Amino acid sequence: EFNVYWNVPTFMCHKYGLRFEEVSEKYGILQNWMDKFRGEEIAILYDPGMFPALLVARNGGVPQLGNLTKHLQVFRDHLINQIPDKSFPGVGVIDFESWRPIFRQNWASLQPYKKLSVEVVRREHPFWDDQRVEQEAKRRFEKYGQLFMEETLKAAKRMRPAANWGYYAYPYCYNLTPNQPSAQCEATTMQENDKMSWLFESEDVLLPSVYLRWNLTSGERVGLVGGRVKEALRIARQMTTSRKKVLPYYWYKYQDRRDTDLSRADLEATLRKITDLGADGFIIWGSSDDINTKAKCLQFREYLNNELGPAVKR
């Protein structure tokens, strides 16, 4: 079975008389009833609850200073508000992007999580040797990072047990990065994904994000997708406990050229890579900002009928 899901917020175009019925009627894409954003096929929760984050530190900033009970209470209300049907049977996507639960992977723009972790240990234990400080910072961050992510996922699964739940973008790969220029995932990240059974055995579906970059060759764009889909399939077949579905998150815009629609050549080669590798389908995502006016709705509909729809159909 191969299932393609509509996760583009075309509900914003309904006020203009554009209901996007062709998604399911012509292109065979699974679509929520009445083209609702959240429905029986799929529902994404954007930054649900009150995950500790650095924005100002929200709920502690780093997970080891966070209030878990506060987060879980808010998360419960957000889930119930957005997914009122207890019997929701679709793909439930938790979109939590503040930090990675692996200390080492909080690089570049996520570096402040590493720094704050160490600062807190140093302040509390000024006379601990540096190795002890570093070790403690990593340990505490990973311990509470795991607690927040695993407890939230457990709560979602308990409250909505008929759905298949997962976190957006995990597992990570970091291919075509400086440090890792080839299309293969970073080796240390592969090892860290292998030891993250607490997350992957609990998830029902793996959702690697495979958004293309414009500043890459055509072959490199396929490689970006391929490396990420292979990482998710390895982990999906890994898992001791179960057989996970793999549904890559796919965007019709370039991640580094956000106003530019994917070319037909790119749609064809990358959607072919996803299917050829044996994924269980894919999820087409869109940003609200790209279809929040009638003219944006009509331009997106033109792209859907000109290129995206046809490519997805076959």
Distance CA(169)–CA(150), nearest Å, equals: 15
C-alpha–C-alpha distance, residues 28 and 312, integer Å: 8
Per the DSSP assignment, residues forming a β-bridge with 307 are none
Domain boundaries, the chain: 1-314
Helix/strand/coil (H/E/C) assignment for every residue in 183-224: CCCCHHHHHHHHCCHHHHCCCCEEECECCCCCCCCHHHHHHH
Annotated catalytic, 97? yes
Determine the Cα angle at 79 with ends 76 and 80, to 5°.
85
Experimentally determined by: X-ray
Give me the resolution in angstroms, 1 decimal: 1.6
Do the strands 164-167 and 91-95 form a parallel or antiparallel pair, or are they unpaired?
parallel
C-alpha–C-alpha distance, residues 65 and 259, integer Å: 38
Measure the CA dihedral 88/93/95/100, to 10°: 130
47 closest CA partner among 69, 70, 79: 79
| Contact status, residue 112 vs residue 191, Cβ threshold 8 Å | no
Question: Top-level CATH class of 1-314?
Answer: alpha beta
Per annotation, catalytic residue among 97, 134, 150, 220: 97
CA 82 – CA 76 distance, rounded (Å): 10
Instruction: Kindly report the length of the chain.
Output: 314
What is the b/e burial string over 77-91, where b = at least 16 CB atoms within 10 angstroms of the residue's CB? ebbeebbeeeebebb
At residue 283, φ and ψ (nearest 5 deg) are: -120, 120
